[PDB]
Each structure stands twice: as C-alpha cells, then as structure tokens.
Design a protein around this nucleic acid. Sequence first.
RNA 1: GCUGUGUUCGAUCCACAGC
Length: 369
Amino acid sequence: GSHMTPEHLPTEQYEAQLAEKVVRLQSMMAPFSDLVPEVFRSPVSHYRMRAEFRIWHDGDDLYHIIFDQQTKSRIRVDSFPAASELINQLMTAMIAGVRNNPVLRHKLFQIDYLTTLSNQAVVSLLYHKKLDDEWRQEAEALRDALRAQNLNVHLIGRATKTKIELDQDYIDERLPVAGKEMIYRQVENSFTQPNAAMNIQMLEWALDVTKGSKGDLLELYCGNGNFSLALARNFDRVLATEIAKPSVAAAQYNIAANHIDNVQIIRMAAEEFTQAMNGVREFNRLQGIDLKSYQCETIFVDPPRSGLDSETEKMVQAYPRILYISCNPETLCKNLETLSQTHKVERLALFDQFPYTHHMQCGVLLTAK
RNA sequence: GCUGUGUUCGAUCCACAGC
C-alpha cells in the first residue's frame, strides 16, 4: 500500500498491524505457494534511520512538518518517534541552531536526516536561495556547535547546482550480522534500507537461505554492496553489478574495509551484462575478468517498488536459484505469474520494515522446477 | 526543456535518470 507514518505511533497496535500484513501476504502468495511464511518484527519505535521533513515558517517560529496522506494538510512535528533517537535529538538541535541565524534560516525549505546504529549522522539543509561564504561561515559554526555536543555529525548545504560538504557526504554503518561485524559506507542521496534492525534480519535470512550453496553468486543493482558483502561467506565467488557511481565507490570501499577477497564489483547495467553472458561483446571494462570462468547458479535481485521489468524477468529465469527481496509484494506477485511457470517457491519471509503503514517488505527463494 | 524516479507522507521547489 502507501500509508504515511504519524508523529504518534500506536504501539499497542503493533502486533495486530503485523498480523494483518501476515495474513495479507499469505493470500497474495496463495496462487504460487502454500508455505507458512517466516516473520520478522521491527522494534515498535525508533526503527527508521533516515527521515526527511519540509520546514514551515510561522513568522520567526519555524518547524518540521509532515503531510496528512488523505487531506494533504500540514502537520507540525516536534518529534518523530518512528525515526531513530539520534534523528530526534538532531531535529531539536537543527531548529535551535537555525531559528535566529537568518542566513541559515532564510529559504530553508527541507531538512534531510541520515543516521546509523554506529551513531554517525548526515544532515542536509536544502534552500530556495544561492549559498555563499557568509552561509558557509555560519554553517561551520553550527557543525562545531553540534560536534561540541558529542554528535558525530556532518552537514550538507544544498541549493540548485550547489552542494557544500562541510567535510563529507557519507557515514559508516556497523551492523552485527550472524556473529561477524560488518562495515557499510552509506552516501547521502544514495539508497539505503531505512530500517537497520530489519536490514540485519534480511541479511541474516539471506545468509541462511543460501547456506551450502555450490559455486558463485550474481547480484544485480547491489547499491553499496549490502547483500553481496554479507552473502560472500556462502559463495566461492561473487559478481555484483552497479551503475550509480557513488554507490559503486561506496561498494568498493566496503570490500576493502571488510577485508573481503571473493567479490568483484562491475560497473554495468543489467542489459549490457546479459550481453556479456549470452552472445558476446568484448567489453572495455570487463576486460580485467573472465565471465566463462565464473559459475553462477544463484542470482540475487532487490528492485524498487516497480519490481523486475520483463527483460530482467526472463534473464533471472536462466538461473537455477533466484533470491528476490521485495519492497512491494504486489509487483513481486506480478513477476511471479511468470517466474512460477519455471520455478517453485522454496522459502518465504515477511519483514516489517515499514511499521504502522500499508507497506510490506518480503523475500522469496525460488528454485528451478 | 520534457518525461520518469526517490523502497515513510511529500518534492513543476532538492536530487538523480532518461530524452
């Protein structure tokens, strides 16, 4: 679905809210499987590690707002308990540091927060105005004021064609995954899973579903390497594709930082990779490595809401094992009308990444009929 | 310019993609 998340969380309803998503997934999946899904719960609050807010000016008072889904009307928000405690503390600080500093305040229309379990933060202040050395001066005092307070925090100043990194635009996550810690660089404006608690569990579920697998793994559009770097434990080698250049950078750093040897990141789109597979095309960039030398019986896929397009649909059907994580079971099911013809559902999970909303995250392991 | 995207609401405003 497409619900909003409210300032007040009906935590008393968490369990009922979940139960309905469980029964919902079950109906949706019925045409393809009779499996009783595995179900992973979110903590009932402070689960969301990034939040964005429009800012509203009330004369000299200003404040973050969200918008009512149905009516479009403006809701003033002093806290946001769905967001991490750190995002909460930074919400108060930011309004404090800007309230009566007119260069920081003027034309300040939204604030983006990015937060980690490891306790780092990246706050972006967006403007309908040009930014200059005067802005940069005051903005520099605000960060030291914040740091002053023991907040590991960077600041990004944005306006049209403008991006002032106080120092930088990434932070480093530390996630405990199946015993071993795990570093993940995360870049502002590049996709990350918003629910870190749920993320740990998707990683872990993927790790269990691909246990004792023979050979190699192929991941498409792997972002900062999230799943690939974890799954590298279960596979002799990993080949992971990504086009977005800061994601590729982050993913590269993430291999180094985790001392991983068995994963190669390839800067390639799905279409011009499959060309390298079936058919040929002597690639400028692949030159370093030999595809025929690799043996991928498992393909991994985690698309946006829209899901797999028809081309990709066909492409993954090539493989004996498909691992598909979704943030929209509706499109997973569309996909599955096709995928079910060639594959059976081996495993099934719900992940409650978006509590108190209609959205559902989930996962499926499909093996060739 | 135009279209599309952004895995909470939300963005002809911030960003990205395609053209």
